[PDB]
């Protein structure tokens, strides 16, 4: 239903949806559970660029978090991490090239200086 609500309702609603998925994620034990929960939060965020676009500090945190999961060994997660990353890079492309508020350098730069550390563990297709 992304885009069927007013941006302002969208915000309040998404803050509630993911604050508690995050909370659930920490709650449930077993990587099997955490992997499912984690993938879902990622799917959700991926579907709400407009949200991401208006909140850089959250966007950046999601992307850095996506980079972390690219080293996750649990089956499927790496595919999730990359798939979400491409949605986000398309839909939020400008926010990576222009200096955002509270930062001194375009985020793309930090990415380019670490390509290797980030893709380390990824399979060819994911790369």
């Amino acid at each position: 239903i992304s885009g069927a609500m007013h941006e302002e309702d969208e915000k309040r609603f998404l803050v509630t949806v993911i604050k508690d998925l995050l909370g659930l994620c920490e709650q449930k034990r077993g990587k099997d559970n955490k992997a499912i929960i984690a993938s879902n939060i990622m799917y959700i965020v991926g579907q709400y660029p407009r949200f991401l676009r208006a909140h850089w500090k959250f966007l950046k945190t999601v992307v850095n978090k996506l980079f972390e999961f690219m080293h996750e060994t649990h089956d499927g997660v790496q595919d999730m991490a990359c798939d979400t990353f491409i949605k986000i890079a398309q839909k939020c492309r400008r926010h990576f090239v222009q200096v955002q508020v509270g930062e001194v350098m375009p985020f793309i730069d930090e990415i380019l200086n670490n390509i290797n550390t980030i893709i380390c563990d990824l399979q060819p297709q994911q790369v």
Partner: peptide, 27 residues
């Protein structure tokens, strides 16, 4: 609207998401 900031505090929360990393606990 001015909109100073708030989403900044919502970021520190996501910092708590375990799944693998190490986990050296067992029965």
């Amino acid at each position: 609207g001015s909109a100073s900031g708030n989403l900044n505090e919502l970021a520190l929360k996501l910092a708590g998401l375990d799944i693998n990393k190490t986990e050296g606990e067992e029965c």
